[PDB]
Amino acid sequence: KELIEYFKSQMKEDPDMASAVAAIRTLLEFLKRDKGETIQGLRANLTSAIETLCGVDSSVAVSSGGELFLRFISLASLEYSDYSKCKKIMIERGELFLRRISLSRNKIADLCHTFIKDGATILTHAYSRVVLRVLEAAVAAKKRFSVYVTESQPDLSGKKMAKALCHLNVPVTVVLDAAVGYIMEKADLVIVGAEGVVENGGIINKIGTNQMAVCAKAQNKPFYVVAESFKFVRLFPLNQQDVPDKFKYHPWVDYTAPSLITLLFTDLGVLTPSAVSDELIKLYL
Amino acid sequence: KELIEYFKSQMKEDPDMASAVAAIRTLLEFLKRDKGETIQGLRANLTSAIETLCGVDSSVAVSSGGELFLRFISLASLEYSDYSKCKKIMIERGELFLRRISLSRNKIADLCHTFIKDGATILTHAYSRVVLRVLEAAVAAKKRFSVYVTESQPDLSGKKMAKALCHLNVPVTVVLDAAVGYIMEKADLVIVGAEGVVENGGIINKIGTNQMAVCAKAQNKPFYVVAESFKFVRLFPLNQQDVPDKFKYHPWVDYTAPSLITLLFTDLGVLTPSAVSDELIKLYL
Amino acid sequence: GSELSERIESFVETLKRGGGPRSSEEMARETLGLLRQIITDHRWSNAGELMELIRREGRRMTAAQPSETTVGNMVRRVLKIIREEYGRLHGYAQLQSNIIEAINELLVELEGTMENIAAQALEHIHSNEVIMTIGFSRTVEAFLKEAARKRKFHVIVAECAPFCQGHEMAVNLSKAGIETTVMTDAAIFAVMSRVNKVIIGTKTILANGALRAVTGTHTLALAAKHHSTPLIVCAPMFKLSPQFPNEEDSFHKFVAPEEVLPFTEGDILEKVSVHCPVFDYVPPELITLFISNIGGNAPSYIYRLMSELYHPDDHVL
């Protein structure tokens, strides 16, 4: 399996690199290495590629990025009638789309860090590069604030987030993961990074998020959720079992109601949670 | 310091024994060993005893039991004018009060386990003998239910609770402490053991409780709190810092709003949370 | 020429000194007339040069008064109209008359806004109804004074403490006979137990569905959310702004504290700190429905009107 080897080579060469962009690069490399002049023959190969990428990596962003890439392949196949020019069209359009995606995080940082007040308190969850990029743009914009990061028990990455913030020389504190309701009254805003956004406006994240969301609901705190556009999922989980069980495995994913979410911070801008369904219905899976 | 030595000898000889009853036994032994014919001379000695018991043990139930014992000493001093008969009156009344207190847990079990349905799901917090006594009376009353116990990260005692329930041969599962909002929709009732009850109806417990309480509020689940009568505290914490800081030391105590609590299960019976203030105002500290 | 800069500076210090004119639809007509005078009195080869020009004078006009967003969003709407015409002509010399006729279409759209809200006003009022409003706005009083032509109901106009402008709304609605009740601003939750729905106006709709309005209406929105009564925001589409709430803390407009605490209070005015914010912030979760001239919209739909009327490249202006 050269696809999983190329995916692990793209994901392990950079620790600042997400899993979804590595999966999209692996899918583009597999489409460039396919050279099969068939629409359904390429669609079945892409579906087996996303099957391998979901059997290997249990992340939601990998399958999300593969579904967006499959919708992009379907749009490029429905646009051009002949396949010979359509192969080069898919290659150039996918390379330009990956170039647009690789600059997305900086766009989130300059368009997101404007909201954070000076002299305030930030409550944040486990390790991701997006909230570090937003916070380093905030401290590059000459802002001072106190940071409380969840320890995030199943893999101690919030302590790694705190180490990365102490190397940034900012006041950060590892707070107990059973104490997100203890420090909610002092946290005037709760900004969190997500790994997958479902259609109605809710999010798919790490297990300690949703309870914090209802701590943001009873205590009236603005629960800000930060995520890019390739994490948009065409699913509707109703209850906590209604997420797909292959992404769970002690649960690993909690569904957060869209009423508990104040704003989203995507590449389209600062959006209401109802905007994700707009993008997902003009995208049509 | 013979008082702390007697307290540790009473608390370490029985693992089924609480800290508050050991503190009341230590206070009764110190009152029997005082032999000082003075009202204020005994009150200052008792206050220094509770000062030592609060400097040694940072539990809220120890200081609560000492304040109830001090109010009992004040009532017995205000009742009898002469101190010579009042010393034996205090000794006999304290021995009879300790005999009444030592049978309290069984009373909680037979008067509390009636509420738990058959074929239901229990959500429970960290290790205490009271919820084990209630659950063993429930399985002695021929009831079957599935138990989800919080792992309770700062001292892994919920796993010890689960081991004590697997030795009882009941279906119990260690659930992630960041997943108390994940399994709230399947938990039709949430029964929890507390270590201290403040005056309005709220409780003082271990740090992972209060967030679960608001998970019981947004998801309409009946949040049952189980505690005896010697855990009644004459305090009013408004915010999470308004608890006394000597009982905190990563926080260890969360204050739970009385609106998030459905019922209490004390030695007076199944009570509304407004009953604790009634008992605390006819007790008068 | 020179007369253009005369009129521009007169508009700038008119916005700087006070409210000139009084209501907002005349101000939007003045802004569109000033913008058509700017595009008819200049010379350009590319549309981007006029775009940079309009961005500079929009920066100047919003630096005159940062609290009033109508001039800024009108400049941004004219910028998106120019961008749409350049995009539809790019895929050259006929651009200027196209922007002129587009500004004329926007003027015909803008003059018939309040009467379109009045035409769709009958779809929200039933017989023997208790209505509570705040402040003073000619859209809401026109709404109620023509909705009382076929229905009979009750309007409770609550005054606002900095400038009791609801007395004018009360004496304007009482001439139409809608059984107007006049109250203070402190009895809202005292009367929220009987108010069936809340029909208010606003000053500026934000990008996330939130709104700034006359002060004390966030309390009214909280009480109406507590009592679960629907909120009707009768607002036009020139009060729609892409400015986010948390942006350089320039939200509230503070005025002189004489109307709160007079100058004849004594020597105690030295050791006191009196603030008078005339505007207030309402989040979109405390709002049920917006009523614009094109119909009723959700607070979960303000982003679509934002992307349909404004461009994300012009948010900095």
Coordinates of N, CA, C and O in Angstrom, one line a residue, chain A residues 151 153-154 159 174-183 185-186 207-212 214-215 217-219 238-241 243 248 250-255, chain B residues 151 153-154 159 174-183 185-186 207-212 214-215 217-219 238-241 243 248 250-255:
Chain A
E151 N -6.1 19.8 30.1 CA -5.0 18.8 30.1 C -5.3 17.7 29.1 O -4.3 17.1 28.6
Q153 N -6.9 14.4 29.0 CA -6.4 13.1 29.5 C -6.1 12.0 28.5 O -5.0 11.3 28.8
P154 N -6.8 11.6 27.5 CA -6.5 10.4 26.7 C -5.2 10.5 26.0 O -4.5 9.4 25.9
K159 N -1.0 19.6 27.7 CA 0.3 20.0 28.3 C 1.4 20.3 27.3 O 2.2 21.2 27.5
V174 N -2.1 24.8 32.8 CA -2.7 23.6 32.6 C -3.8 23.5 33.7 O -3.5 23.4 34.9
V175 N -5.1 23.5 33.3 CA -6.2 23.4 34.2 C -6.7 22.0 34.1 O -6.5 21.3 33.1
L176 N -7.2 21.5 35.2 CA -7.7 20.1 35.3 C -8.9 20.0 34.3 O -9.8 20.8 34.2
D177 N -9.0 18.8 33.6 CA -10.0 18.6 32.6 C -11.4 18.3 33.3 O -12.4 18.5 32.6
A178 N -11.4 18.0 34.6 CA -12.6 18.0 35.3 C -13.0 19.3 36.0 O -13.9 19.4 36.7
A179 N -12.2 20.4 35.6 CA -12.4 21.7 36.2 C -12.8 22.7 35.1 O -12.5 23.9 35.3
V180 N -13.4 22.3 34.0 CA -13.8 23.3 33.0 C -15.0 24.0 33.4 O -15.3 25.1 32.8
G181 N -15.8 23.5 34.3 CA -16.9 24.2 34.9 C -16.5 25.1 36.1 O -17.3 25.9 36.5
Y182 N -15.3 24.8 36.6 CA -14.8 25.6 37.8 C -14.3 27.0 37.3 O -14.4 28.0 38.0
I183 N -13.6 27.0 36.1 CA -13.0 28.2 35.6 C -13.9 28.8 34.5 O -13.4 29.7 33.8
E185 N -16.6 30.7 34.9 CA -17.1 32.1 35.3 C -16.0 33.1 35.2 O -16.3 34.3 35.1
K186 N -14.7 32.7 35.2 CA -13.7 33.7 35.0 C -13.3 33.8 33.5 O -12.6 34.7 33.1
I207 N -13.2 14.7 23.0 CA -14.3 14.2 23.9 C -14.7 15.3 25.0 O -15.8 15.3 25.5
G208 N -13.7 16.1 25.4 CA -14.0 17.0 26.5 C -14.5 18.4 26.1 O -14.5 19.3 26.8
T209 N -15.1 18.5 24.8 CA -15.5 19.7 24.3 C -17.0 20.0 24.7 O -17.3 21.1 25.2
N210 N -17.9 19.1 24.4 CA -19.3 19.4 24.4 C -19.8 19.8 25.8 O -20.7 20.7 25.9
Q211 N -19.3 19.1 26.9 CA -19.7 19.5 28.2 C -19.2 20.9 28.5 O -20.0 21.7 29.1
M212 N -18.1 21.3 28.0 CA -17.6 22.7 28.1 C -18.6 23.6 27.4 O -18.9 24.7 27.9
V214 N -21.8 23.2 27.2 CA -23.0 23.5 28.0 C -22.6 24.3 29.2 O -23.4 25.0 29.7
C215 N -21.3 24.2 29.6 CA -20.8 25.2 30.6 C -20.8 26.6 30.0 O -20.9 27.5 30.8
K217 N -23.2 27.5 28.1 CA -24.6 27.8 27.8 C -25.2 28.2 29.1 O -26.0 29.2 29.1
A218 N -25.0 27.5 30.2 CA -25.6 27.9 31.5 C -24.9 29.2 32.1 O -25.6 29.9 32.9
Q219 N -23.7 29.5 31.7 CA -23.0 30.6 32.2 C -22.8 31.7 31.2 O -22.0 32.6 31.4
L238 N -27.6 13.2 15.7 CA -28.7 13.7 16.5 C -28.4 13.5 18.0 O -28.5 14.5 18.8
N239 N -28.0 12.3 18.4 CA -27.5 12.0 19.7 C -26.0 11.7 19.7 O -25.4 11.8 18.6
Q240 N -25.5 11.3 20.8 CA -24.1 11.0 20.9 C -23.7 9.7 20.3 O -22.5 9.6 19.9
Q241 N -24.6 8.8 20.1 CA -24.3 7.6 19.3 C -24.4 7.8 17.8 O -24.0 6.9 17.1
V243 N -23.1 9.8 15.7 CA -21.8 9.9 15.0 C -21.4 8.5 14.5 O -21.8 7.5 15.1
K248 N -15.0 6.8 16.5 CA -14.8 6.7 18.0 C -13.5 6.0 18.4 O -12.6 6.5 19.0
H250 N -14.4 4.1 26.4 CA -13.6 5.3 26.3 C -13.8 6.0 25.0 O -13.1 5.8 24.1
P251 N -14.8 6.9 25.0 CA -15.1 7.6 23.7 C -14.1 8.8 23.4 O -13.5 9.4 24.3
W252 N -14.0 9.0 22.1 CA -13.0 10.0 21.6 C -13.6 11.2 20.9 O -12.9 12.2 20.7
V253 N -14.9 11.1 20.6 CA -15.6 12.2 19.8 C -17.0 12.5 20.5 O -17.8 11.6 20.7
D254 N -17.2 13.8 20.7 CA -18.4 14.3 21.3 C -19.1 15.3 20.3 O -18.5 16.1 19.7
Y255 N -20.4 15.1 20.1 CA -21.1 16.0 19.2 C -21.6 17.2 20.0 O -22.2 17.0 21.1
Chain B
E151 N -13.9 8.3 36.1 CA -12.5 7.8 36.5 C -11.9 8.7 37.5 O -11.0 8.2 38.3
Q153 N -9.8 11.7 37.7 CA -8.3 11.8 37.5 C -7.4 12.2 38.6 O -6.3 11.6 38.7
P154 N -7.7 13.2 39.5 CA -6.6 13.5 40.5 C -6.2 12.4 41.5 O -5.0 12.4 41.8
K159 N -11.9 4.2 39.6 CA -11.5 2.9 39.2 C -11.6 1.9 40.3 O -11.9 0.7 40.2
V174 N -15.9 2.0 33.8 CA -15.2 3.3 33.9 C -15.4 4.1 32.7 O -14.9 3.7 31.6
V175 N -16.0 5.2 32.8 CA -16.3 6.2 31.7 C -15.2 7.3 31.9 O -14.8 7.6 33.0
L176 N -14.8 7.8 30.8 CA -13.9 8.9 30.8 C -14.4 10.2 31.5 O -15.6 10.5 31.3
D177 N -13.6 10.8 32.3 CA -14.1 12.0 33.0 C -14.3 13.2 32.2 O -15.0 14.1 32.6
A178 N -13.8 13.2 31.0 CA -14.1 14.2 30.0 C -15.3 13.8 29.1 O -15.7 14.5 28.2
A179 N -16.0 12.7 29.5 CA -17.1 12.2 28.8 C -18.4 12.1 29.6 O -19.3 11.3 29.3
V180 N -18.5 12.9 30.6 CA -19.8 13.0 31.4 C -20.9 13.7 30.7 O -22.1 13.5 31.0
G181 N -20.6 14.5 29.6 CA -21.6 15.0 28.8 C -21.9 14.1 27.6 O -22.9 14.3 26.9
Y182 N -21.1 13.1 27.3 CA -21.3 12.2 26.2 C -22.3 11.1 26.6 O -23.1 10.7 25.8
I183 N -22.3 10.7 27.9 CA -23.2 9.6 28.3 C -24.3 10.2 29.2 O -25.0 9.5 29.9
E185 N -27.1 11.7 28.0 CA -28.4 11.4 27.3 C -28.9 9.9 27.6 O -30.1 9.7 27.5
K186 N -28.0 9.0 27.9 CA -28.4 7.7 28.2 C -28.6 7.5 29.7 O -29.2 6.5 30.1
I207 N -14.0 17.8 42.2 CA -14.0 18.8 41.2 C -14.8 18.5 40.0 O -15.3 19.4 39.3
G208 N -15.0 17.3 39.6 CA -15.7 16.9 38.4 C -17.2 16.8 38.5 O -17.9 16.3 37.7
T209 N -17.8 17.4 39.6 CA -19.2 17.2 39.9 C -20.1 18.3 39.2 O -21.1 18.0 38.5
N210 N -19.7 19.6 39.4 CA -20.6 20.7 39.0 C -20.9 20.8 37.5 O -22.0 21.1 37.1
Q211 N -19.9 20.5 36.7 CA -20.1 20.5 35.3 C -21.1 19.4 34.9 O -22.0 19.6 34.1
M212 N -21.0 18.2 35.6 CA -22.0 17.2 35.4 C -23.4 17.6 35.8 O -24.4 17.3 35.1
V214 N -24.5 20.7 35.4 CA -25.1 21.5 34.3 C -25.4 20.6 33.1 O -26.3 20.9 32.4
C215 N -24.7 19.5 33.0 CA -25.1 18.5 32.0 C -26.4 17.9 32.4 O -27.2 17.4 31.6
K217 N -28.6 19.7 33.7 CA -29.6 20.8 33.6 C -30.0 21.0 32.2 O -31.2 21.2 31.9
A218 N -29.1 21.0 31.3 CA -29.4 21.2 29.8 C -30.1 20.0 29.3 O -30.8 20.1 28.3
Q219 N -29.9 18.8 29.8 CA -30.4 17.6 29.3 C -31.5 17.0 30.2 O -31.9 15.9 30.1
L238 N -20.7 31.9 46.6 CA -21.5 32.5 45.5 C -20.9 32.1 44.2 O -21.6 31.7 43.3
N239 N -19.6 32.4 44.0 CA -18.8 31.9 42.8 C -17.9 30.8 43.2 O -17.9 30.3 44.4
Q240 N -17.1 30.4 42.3 CA -16.2 29.2 42.5 C -15.0 29.6 43.4 O -14.4 28.7 44.0
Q241 N -14.6 30.9 43.5 CA -13.6 31.3 44.4 C -14.1 31.5 45.8 O -13.3 31.6 46.8
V243 N -15.7 29.6 47.9 CA -15.4 28.5 48.8 C -14.1 28.9 49.6 O -13.3 29.7 49.0
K248 N -9.3 23.9 49.1 CA -8.9 23.6 47.7 C -7.6 22.8 47.7 O -7.5 21.6 47.3
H250 N -4.7 23.5 40.0 CA -5.4 22.2 40.0 C -6.4 22.2 41.2 O -6.0 21.8 42.3
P251 N -7.6 22.6 41.0 CA -8.6 22.7 42.0 C -9.2 21.4 42.4 O -9.3 20.4 41.5
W252 N -9.7 21.2 43.6 CA -10.2 20.0 44.2 C -11.6 20.1 44.6 O -12.2 19.0 44.8
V253 N -12.2 21.3 44.7 CA -13.6 21.4 45.1 C -14.4 22.4 44.2 O -13.9 23.5 43.9
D254 N -15.6 21.9 43.7 CA -16.4 22.7 42.9 C -17.8 23.0 43.6 O -18.3 22.1 44.2
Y255 N -18.2 24.2 43.5 CA -19.5 24.5 44.2 C -20.6 24.3 43.1 O -20.5 24.8 42.0

